[PDB]
């Protein structure tokens, strides 16, 4: 419905290996938006067209602050192009990567946004793929928004590299690496090999540091359990001792 003519293209937010985001504004609205290209040849030699095509047909139906808005989407069809919210204070990759760590507030503040947004994704059965601190993104007064569509082993589930059928269970796997990941400054089974990083998920094999502190301990040794069934509910994660006591935004 819509065409590359409608919008004004600006930097180069970022650039991918299946295309480019650049910084975009439609010329009838001066609306500021985020614009994806996409190469179709890529998609096709890769086929994840339809993984593509399906994971936008399930954000189109998501409306939810801590989850980045997805306007819509066109093509030439030489390239796709997809119409996305603007995030100003980009991803948590690079707040991560600028601040080393993140203190206890500022951590359970993000898996509070995060807890929330997938308790509203569980409620509405859609469950997420694999979150990474990359896939992050940060509006303009500083809330965290998932932006990756996806309805590295560093943040995949054991049962989901072992071959194993996955559920909801899988995300709080994923809170519970981000977690760490946002206090120590690496992901917990973080490697120099593929081959590696598979052993030390499937044997759930990470170690705490001295400064993270318990309650913080807990809940990710309670979000990181091998067995779904004894991973908590993201009702539990927004009720736990030490979110409630370091969170600044409520659930």
């Given amino acids: 419905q819509w065409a590359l003519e409608d919008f004004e293209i600006g930097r180069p937010?970022?650039?991918?290996?299946?295309?480019?985001?650049?910084?975009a504004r439609e010329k009838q609205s001066k609306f500021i938006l985020?614009?994806?290209?996409?190469?179709?040849?890529?998609?096709?030699?890769?086929?994840?067209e339809h993984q593509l095509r399906r994971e936008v047909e399930i954000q189109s139906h998501l409306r939810?602050?801590?989850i980045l808005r997805l306007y819509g989407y066109f093509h030439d069809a030489t390239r796709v192009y997809l119409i996305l919210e603007y995030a100003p204070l980009g991803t948590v990759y690079r707040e991560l990567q600028?601040?080393?760590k993140f203190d206890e507030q500022r951590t359970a503040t993000y898996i509070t946004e995060l807890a929330?947004?997938?308790?509203?994704?569980?409620?509405?059965?859609?469950?997420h793929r694999d979150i990474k601190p990359e896939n992050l993104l940060l509006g303009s007064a500083g809330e965290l928004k998932i932006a990756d569509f996806g309805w590295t082993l560093?943040?995949?589930?054991?049962?989901?590299?072992?071959?194993?059928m996955h559920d909801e269970?899988?995300?709080?796997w994923s809170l519970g690496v981000l977690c760490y990941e946002f206090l120590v400054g690496k992901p917990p089974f973080e490697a120099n090999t593929y081959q590696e990083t598979y052993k030390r998920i499937?044997?759930?094999?990470?170690?705490?540091?001295?400064?993270?502190?318990?309650?913080?301990?807990?809940?990710?040794?309670?979000?990181?359990?091998?067995?779904?069934?004894?991973?908590?509910?993201?009702?539990?994660?927004?009720?736990?001792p030490w979110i409630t006591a370091n969170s600044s935004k409520p659930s």
């Fill in 202 to 240: 499937s044997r759930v094999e990470f170690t705490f540091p001295d400064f993270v502190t318990e309650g913080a301990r807990d809940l990710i040794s309670r979000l990181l359990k091998h067995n779904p069934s004894q991973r908590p509910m993201l009702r539990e994660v927004l009720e736990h």
């Fill in 64 to 66: 939810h602050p801590n």
């Fill in 169 to 172: 269970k899988v995300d709080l």
């Fill in 116 to 127: 929330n947004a997938l308790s509203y994704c569980h409620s509405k059965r859609v469950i």
């Fill in 34 to 48: 985020a614009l994806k290209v996409l190469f179709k040849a890529q998609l096709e030699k890769a086929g994840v």
């Fill in 98 to 100: 600028k601040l080393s």
């Fill in 154 to 164: 560093d943040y995949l589930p054991p049962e989901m590299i072992e071959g194993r």
């Fill in 13 to 23: 937010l970022g650039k991918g290996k299946f295309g480019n985001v650049y910084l």
